Amino acid sequence: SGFRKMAFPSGKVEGCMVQVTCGTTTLNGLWLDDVVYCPRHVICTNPNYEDLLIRKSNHNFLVQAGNVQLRVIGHSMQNCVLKLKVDTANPKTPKYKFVRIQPGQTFSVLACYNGSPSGVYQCAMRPNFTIKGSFLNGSCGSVGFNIDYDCVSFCYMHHMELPTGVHAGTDLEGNFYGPFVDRQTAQAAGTDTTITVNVLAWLYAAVINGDRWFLNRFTTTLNDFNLVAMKYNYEPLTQDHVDILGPLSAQTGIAVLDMCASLKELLQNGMNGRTILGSALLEDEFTPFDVVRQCSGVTF
């Protein structure tokens, strides 16, 4: 029993983190095979990054894997990520893929400083394409990932903090999540919305763990609920979301539209001094799979 915000074991990624220093800036890079990936804004000196990089020589890039130093033998740019070719293939390179995640999906973040891992936590790609992480100066290049079996799927590289304190980054191919640029300009997180399918998944997690007070005899329609959803700044619930929740509906005897009626009442009446899984708010950073994985016991 118990339900907790749980990150993937980070060992396979710790062995890939390195420190990258160009000019005055130091941040983190990801060492896979014979390439180090890091944010292109490490580029020394409204920037024209292709033009700034030609001035740079391989030996301007200091790369350290612990005490050991890696020799840069080439450099290239892919969107907002810089790729440093090094002389040595990382002997601890895991089986891995680069993937791009969708809003509402979760991943583990390995927060790093000076190439040394310092913490791991779970976070969701918000509908406004930010994440609510915990990053200080020097965390740029920290990465986000999921693990399926022995395969690490890298999905996020951290680039910047926005004025509201939330965070923005790219996939490992250098494409930003959301309408952001890697520049000193005026940028702001858009208005956010609540990830409806994830709230429902969390209510099923609560039921599985004995928290049942919010259940009621009623059910609703997808059309009726989604009108309540938009009213409360909740993402629309689609039939595909209903399908994904199928497993949990079968396991608990609570149909999704049966649970939507519960969520409707919670949105309209509050929780009246009660809590669900130790929270006084509705939590939307657990996916249906996160709830199945943790209420069943998958391992890596």
Next chain:
Amino acid sequence: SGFRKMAFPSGKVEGCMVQVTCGTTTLNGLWLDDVVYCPRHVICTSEDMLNPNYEDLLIRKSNHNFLVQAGNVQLRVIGHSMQNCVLKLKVDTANPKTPKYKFVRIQPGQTFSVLACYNGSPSGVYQCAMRPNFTIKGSFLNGSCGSVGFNIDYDCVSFCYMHHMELPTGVHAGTDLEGNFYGPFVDRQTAQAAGTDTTITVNVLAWLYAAVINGDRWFLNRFTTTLNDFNLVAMKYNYEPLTQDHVDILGPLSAQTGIAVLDMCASLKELLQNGMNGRTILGSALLEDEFTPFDVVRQCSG
């Protein structure tokens, strides 16, 4: 900016998790140098578990009865000993991935990271606190016995918890790595219950300081309090007493923020009296007590 329940990177502990099998029972062990540590109830049957005589049970075991598996490598047991409620299996191979480590017994309110493990394979990592009633609020399923809790300040792993069982209220109990249970619990199936829990006052105060550091001041007030008047109010909300040690420990965060410790206590008093009025603090609608003062400085400063 931001403030999150942050676990330590788990790789140094992942390299130590093994599977231990006795009879029909399989659980997790911790492999450091040439020793595998696991809960001694791995030698029990469910019948034994009402009033097991562990000394009598262990003397009947042969080394080859213990099947220890590290990945796809079967380790061979060459001896065994029992220390309180932990079984120490001597193996013929030292773990080449053994980190710098220590065993530490922690006090209520301390936090640590838990590496949930099944059949010797890590599943996930999350942050826990030792509650005042010597339980933890974890996420543990059947087969999680032997999972460990740890901290990694500098590059040394301090092991502080090994998971043994789940109590009737859904909370969890275990030992330190010397085999001594936290709290009054025993590794028997006899009736046992967690005591009434209380809120870890010093940690709430640390978290409120974290909130100020992150730029939130809505809960401050113009009042102060004596330490004794604070504790008279706090105990009425089932909060732990705040000691002069707790006040000393908060000195650094007080200095950084410019808010005296007893002024922050006055703010907490008001929050307990009023609630949040539909507001949040660091994204929570409740007062969070599983961040220590040391945690706050670690995450908000370095």
